Structure 1
Amino acid sequence: STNPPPPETSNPNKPKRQTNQLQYLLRVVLKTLWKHQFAWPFQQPVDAVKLNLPDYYKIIKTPMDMGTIKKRLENNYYWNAQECIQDFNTMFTNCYIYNKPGDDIVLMAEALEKLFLQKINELPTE
């Protein structure tokens, strides 16, 4: 049993960019979520092998985690803020799809998502 290769955090063939919105996503949004008490299970890809979740990557085909997002932001991997927002939304959605409603990990994701939405509500223009 193995985990898939993690999502790429850079790619020489994908145009790269920095915008004030992407700077906000790294400096304000990611930072705020990263330090939350519930953040640690989301700071790296799910190790389905060590967690003994053999069906995890049979079900979740678009994995995403905040460690990947952090590195993408640091590497200027994204062209725009929408791409990064989509990664956050993919992470939350994956958690709601794989896990039973009311599971602790779901409650943790829900708290992180509420904070995410509060922070992105003030995403600056441009």
Structure 2
Amino acid sequence: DPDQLYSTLKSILQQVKSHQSAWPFMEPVKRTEAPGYYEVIRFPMDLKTMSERLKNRYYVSKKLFMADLQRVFTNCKEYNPPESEYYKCANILEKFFFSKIKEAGLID
């Protein structure tokens, strides 16, 4: 079911967005926030871009959704020091994300 997958991913994405550790990932990283970010991170991703992708019916599979959200975390951990707040946020939100995927029974 297409609309089943859509509904589930939308619920999950909205919960991830409302979480208090999501704030670093809500929109594209701004050049002024991180000058030369876009020279280091070749595949940028953020939750706004994911919202649009979802609305645009891009997430036809679990795999695609997971790949994008994971990219958000791996960009963060590649760019930032391990004890930075942004790195801490990524691991907290990743935990939350996995509980939500499991809670949904969302399998591939």
TM band (smaller chain)? 0.7 to 0.9
Cα shift readout 1:13-33 (whole Å, capped 9, x = no counterpart): xxxx93423321111x11111
**Residue 70 (1) aligns with residue 51 (2):** yes
Distance 2:106 2:86 in 1: 31
Distance 1:106 1:95 in 2: 6
Which of residues 34, 51, 72 in structure 1 aligns to 2:17?
34
Tell me the secondary structure at the aligned position of residue 95 of structure 1: helix
Unaligned runs of 5+ in 2: none
Q: What is the total number of aligned residue pairs between the two structures?
A: 107
**Residue 25 (1) aligns with residue 19 (2):** no
TM-score between the two structures when normalised by the length of structure 2: 0.88
Unaligned runs of 5+ in 1: 1-16
Identity of counterpart residues, as a percentage?
36
Larger Rg: 1
Distance 1:82 1:22 in 2: 13
Cα shift readout 1:11-59 (whole Å, capped 9, x = no counterpart): xxxxxx93423321111x11111111121221110002x21x2221111
Tell me the secondary structure at the aligned position of residue 67 of structure 1: helix
More helix by share: 2
- CA RMSD of superposed structures (Å): 1.8
**Residue 57 (1) aligns with residue 41 (2):** no
TM-score between the two structures when normalised by the length of structure 1: 0.76
Structure 1 contact 39–112 (Cα < 8 Å) conserved: yes
Distance 1:26 1:96 in 2: 25
**Residue 100 (1) aligns with residue 81 (2):** yes
Q: 1:88: which partner in 2?
A: 69
Q: Compared with structure 1, are the counterparts of its residues 123 and 70 closer, same or farther at alpha carbon in structure 2 (3 Å cutoff)?
A: farther
